[PDB]
Write a protein that binds this DNA or RNA. Structure first.
Ligand SMILES: CC(C)C[C@H](N)C(=O)O
Ligand SMILES: [Hg+2]
Ligand SMILES: [Zn+2]
Ligand SMILES: [Zn+2]
Length: 876
RNA sequence: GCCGGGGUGGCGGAAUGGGUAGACGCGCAUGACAUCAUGUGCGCAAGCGUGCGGGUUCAAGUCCCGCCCCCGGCACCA
């Protein structure tokens, strides 16, 4: 009997599929129903290890499966080559972006191949290639003609390291999404913006009937931050200008004891009295250089400064002082807020800090508010000290005060969103050029459609493209010196480049027509493949990619190019992958595990000594090491940085693909985080082995046996197996359609074990033949090699043309099941009787069990509950 | 503090229209020549066992009431 050998069959079969062209997506899916399985394309930066493969595998399992079922599958793959992620990688290794990009793409593309993964590469797409970004620019123009793209000056986020501006969504915890060790800063500058906010309502209203992870949906709702309320106009004293503010508590208007303007608000300086004019300019610019991190380090000791001007409370008419404090966001509402310390803990704290007035106008139902208040009372209540509103309820009060302000023309009801606009212009070389020219006479002029693409200046000098503070294209007149396509005089091309997230925002749409030189894609085509039925990815693109794509699809929908309005119908979010990591040497002494500083620091814990127990309790262990000392190991995220990756190729060579697949899809539940391990792999070896042995050993017999027969005529073990078979066929089919792989696999390990047992007694019957035909077909998605291999010992064509096994309902039916006999609620034993056996039969069969405990325990019995399914309770 | 999801074996994890808890796998332990085969929730035992405390029921991981700890999210309203 031969043995299972990966190398001998793996690469073999891989070529076979590639050449046979099975996962080649059709152009316009017929009435066969389509399936668009797609995983987020990668950032060509770094080598591919196992942690990275978890997502593509699943997409492969899924794609293969759907393919067998007959659906027209589209399982594209490509590269998110342009932007900061890539360029920053290259620049780190002093390599030229274009070289570094095509280097990874080559490697990465090999790994995937070495894994059994099949794409329809006739659709590969590289974002940084002119053939692609050509269209980023064509889109950008169409957005401009619809006034969705524009320029504007103001403070923006700046990443010193990246040496460019970042969108708000690229500022995770006031730090760069890439350099979580670099505190983002603020700078005055004029950039480009996409009016995503013009889609704030739809972007929210459509999240409703969506089948996505709660976590994601939640986050977007918070990022969009819709907030119903009112815009109130406070007349400034002496001047003509009226200052507007936003609030959700118009019912506390009489509580307004002072206004507050954002340090960057226009009037903050145009109102500050001369004697203060200096103190304001000092603080205004002080709040600027203050990084978000620095702000969030003050707690509630917020700062502020009195301008020197006053305003009139459009409700009472009294003169309230006007201040300015960083806690107010120029980018939110109207950069101005009416302060009501009595009903807002943030304002309250401020008021009490700078000796400002606190005035209650909302009374708590029942137990009166302790005067003087010691804390702002926010909850609803009754309106007091509020002119003609006294005795009204906060709730009804609002719409009233609103309708009121609206009548007097002092304010209006208005909805505002937290969502700020999208800042896409970037000061980096490696990126799409913004198709705009800056004529001196006409101003900002768009490049003609046909004059596209605006090719990127070829710069083969690393030390040149390196960002120093402004677009590298600024020192290249050969590029930025052109003529205005409007008047004709001398103009200047835009030196800034679109951000990476601009191209990743519609690729899924590009794969549907990867070679279109007239349009970014043919509507007819994309309409036949969208939306994306399944979308494997990660949650780190919650407010980013998953946000922007929705915008872009809505925009493209309005141009009438895409019929849907939500790109990703389904969306899975796989979990991290960990791996036992070496943390360093330790000094064991009995039970005391003293830690040398280098190790401790790596563990990142305050303790400098632990007990053999704590080391265990924290999930670590002590191993012997090549340096002849004891090292401490403990899982950790598998990453290059950690140097605990498990390289795809170096692995498949020594082990196998299918082995890595199984070890990955059975480690734990997909969404959970697994821990790649030796034992994990060893187990996959054994599972794959036995699958092989079993079919090998009955190969000859199988060949001379026919797999045809009449099910109803089956009896005994035969009939038994036939059930267990379809029992499995069902669990497996469902588990797949629900992305629950671990169990689909185990469902197979279990039937395998079933097949072995069946041989201990029964020969090699037709049913058994069929049992293998089905086992293989089902195994395909997980171990496509070993399956195709064994499958050919008895069948001609590839598993790809076998179809998915048809489940047989009638077969799932039980007869003579195993009921459990319990005495007085406690399970005393079990018996074997039909699913229909009447109480009399069960009672009987039970009264004489192994230990006849049902008898020794039931020497009285009163009531007897009997669930024909599997229960018989003898209530003593 | 609010919101979503979670606490099950030495380990990852199965099973909730109440109805042999712990499938499948790992690990361990014996029997055979790294691998198969058998066993493996805990306790010597009475007996006990799905985060804690009550309760409903012949029967509770599943249902009711009160509560703790964990993970993730937190814009507005309340
Ligand atoms: C779909 C893309 C936005 C995914 C992103 N390029 C990444 O690989 O992290
Ligand atoms: Hg390129
Ligand atoms: Zn950065
Ligand atoms: Zn001009």
């Amino acid at each position: 009997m031969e043995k299972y050998n990966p190398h001998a069959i793996e690469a073999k079969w891989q070529r076979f599929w590639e050449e046979k062209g099975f996962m080649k997506a059709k152009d316009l899916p017929g009435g066969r129903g389509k399936q668009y399985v797609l995983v987020m394309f990668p950032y060509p930066s770094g080598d591919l290890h196992m942690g990275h493969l978890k997502n593509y595998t699943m997409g492969d399992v899924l794609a293969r499966f759907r393919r067998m079922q007959g659906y027209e599958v589209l399982h594209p793959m490509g590269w998110d080559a342009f932007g900061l992620p890539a360029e920053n990688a290259a620049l780190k290794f002093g390599v030229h972006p274009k070289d570094w990009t095509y280097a990874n793409i080559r490697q990465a593309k090999e790994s995937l191949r070495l894994m059994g993964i099949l794409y329809d590469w006739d659709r590969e797409v590289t974002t940084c290639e002119p053939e692609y970004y050509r269209w980023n620019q064509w889109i950008f123009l169409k957005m401009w003609e619809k006034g969705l793209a524009y320029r504007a000056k103001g403070l923006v986020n700046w990443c010193p390291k990246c040496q460019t501006v970042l969108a708000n969504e690229q500022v995770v915890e006031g730090r760069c999404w890439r350099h979580e060790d670099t505190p983002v800063e603020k700078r005055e500058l004029e950039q480009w913006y996409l009016r995503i906010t013009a889609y704030a309502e739809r972007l929210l209203k459509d999240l409703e009937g969506l089948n996505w992870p709660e976590k994601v949906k939640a986050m977007q709702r918070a990022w969009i931050g819709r907030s119903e309320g009112a815009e109130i106009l406070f007349p400034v004293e002496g001047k003509e200008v009226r200052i507007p503010v936003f609030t959700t508590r118009p019912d506390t208007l009489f509580g307004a004891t002072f206004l507050v303007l954002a340090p960057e608000h226009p009037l903050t300086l145009e109102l500050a009295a001369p004697e203060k004019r200096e103190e304001v300019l000092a603080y205004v610019e002080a709040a600027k250089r203050k990084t978000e991190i620095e702000r969030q380090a003050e707690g509630r000791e917020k700062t502020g400064v009195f301008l020197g001007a006053y305003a009139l409370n459009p409700a009472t008419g009294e003169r309230i002082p006007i201040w300015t404090a960083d806690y107010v966001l120029f980018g939110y509402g109207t950069g101005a807020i009416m302060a009501v310390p009595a009903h807002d803990q943030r304002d309250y704290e401020f008021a009490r800090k700078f000796g400002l007035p606190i005035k209650k106008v909302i009374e708590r139902p029942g137990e009166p508010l302790p005067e003087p208040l010691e804390r702002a009372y926010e909850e609803p209540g009754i309106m007091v000290n509020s002119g003609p509103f006294d005795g009204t309820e906060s709730e009804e009060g609002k719409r009233k005060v609103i309708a009121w302000l609206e009548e007097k023309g002092l304010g209006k009801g208005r909805v505002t969103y937290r969502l700020r606009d999208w800042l896409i212009s970037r000061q980096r070389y490696w990126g799409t050029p913004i198709p705009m020219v800056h004529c001196e006479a006409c101003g900002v002029v768009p490049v003609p459609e046909e004059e596209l693409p605006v090719l990127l200046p070829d710069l083969k000098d690393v030390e040149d493209i390196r960002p120093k503070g402004k677009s590298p294209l600024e020192a290249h007149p050969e590029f930025y010196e052109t003529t205005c396509p409007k008047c004709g005089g001398p103009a200047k091309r835009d030196t800034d480049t679109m951000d990476t997230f601009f191209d990743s925002s519609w690729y899924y749409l590009r794969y549907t027509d990867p070679h279109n030189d007239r349009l970014p894609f043919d509507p007819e085509k994309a309409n036949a493949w969208m939306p994306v039925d399944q979308y494997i990815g990660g949650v780190e693109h919650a407010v980013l990619h998953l946000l922007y794509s929705r915008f872009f699809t809505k925009f493209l929908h309005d141009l009438g190019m895409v019929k849907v309005e939500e790109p990703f119908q389904g969306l899975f979010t796989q979990g991290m992958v960990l791996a036992w990591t070496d943390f360093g040497p330790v000094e064991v002494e009995g039970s005391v595990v003293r830690l040398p500083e280098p190790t401790r620091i790596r563990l990142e814990i305050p303790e400098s000594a632990l007990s053999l127990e704590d080391v265990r309790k924290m999930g670590a262990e002590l191993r012997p090491h090549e340096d002849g000392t004891l090292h401490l190991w403990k899982p950790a995220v598998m990453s290059k940085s950690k140097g605990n990756g498990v390289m795809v190729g170096p692995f498949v060579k020594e082990q196998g693909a299918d082995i890595a697949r199984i070890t990955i899809l059975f480690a734990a539940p997909p969404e959970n985080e697994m821990v790649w391990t030796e034992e994990g792999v060893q187990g996959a070896w054994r599972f794959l082995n036995r699958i092989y042995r079993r079919v090998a050993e009955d190969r000859e017999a199988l060949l001379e046996t026919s797999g045809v027969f009449q099910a109803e005529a089956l009896e005994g073990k035969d009939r038994e197996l036939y059930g267990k078979l379809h029992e499995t066929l069902k669990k497996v089919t469902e588990d797949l359609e629900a992305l629950r792989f671990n169990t689909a696999i185990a469902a197979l390990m279990e039937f395998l074990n079933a097949l072995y047992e069946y041989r201990k007694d029964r020969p090699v019957t037709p049913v058994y033949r069929t049992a293998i035909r089905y086992y293989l077909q089902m195994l395909f998605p997980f171990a496509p090699h070993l399956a195709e291999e064994l499958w050919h010992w008895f069948w001609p064509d590839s598993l790809f043309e076998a179809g998915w096994p048809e489940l047989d309902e009638k077969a799932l039916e039980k007869d003579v099941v195993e009921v459990a006999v319990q005495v007085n609620g406690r399970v005393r034993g079990t018996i074997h009787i039909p699913k229909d056996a009447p109480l009399e039969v069960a009672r009987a069969e039970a009264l004489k069990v192994r230990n006849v405990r049902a008898h020794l325990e039931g020497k009285e019995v009163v009531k007897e509950i009997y669930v024909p399914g599997k229960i018989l309770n003898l209530v003593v």
